């Protein structure tokens, strides 16, 4: 397993499919330039009033309420 799913993607060593040295990570809504994005960014927006939800800082998926 591998931590990104493109062999083109430069946040991971190609040899070992796992992150360079320094990356957090490769992919998701919030991973920028391999580090996790800023806590409290927007990364997704319903339709509607529902609450959007906003990277935390520690994780390069943009979660949900539940």
């Known amino acids: 397993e591998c931590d990104c799913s493109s062999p083109e993607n ?3 060593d190609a040899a070992t499919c796992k992150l360079r040295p320094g990356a957090q990570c490769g992919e998701g809504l919030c991973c920028e330039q391999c580090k ?3 806590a409290g960014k927007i990364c997704r927006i319903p339709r509607g009033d529902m609450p959007d939800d906003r ?8 979660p949900r309420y539940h």
Not at 55 to 62: K, N, P, V, Y
């Open 10 to 12: 430069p946040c991971c």
């Open 36 to 38: 996790f994005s800023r």
């Open 55 to 62: 990277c935390t800082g520690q994780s390069a998926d943009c």
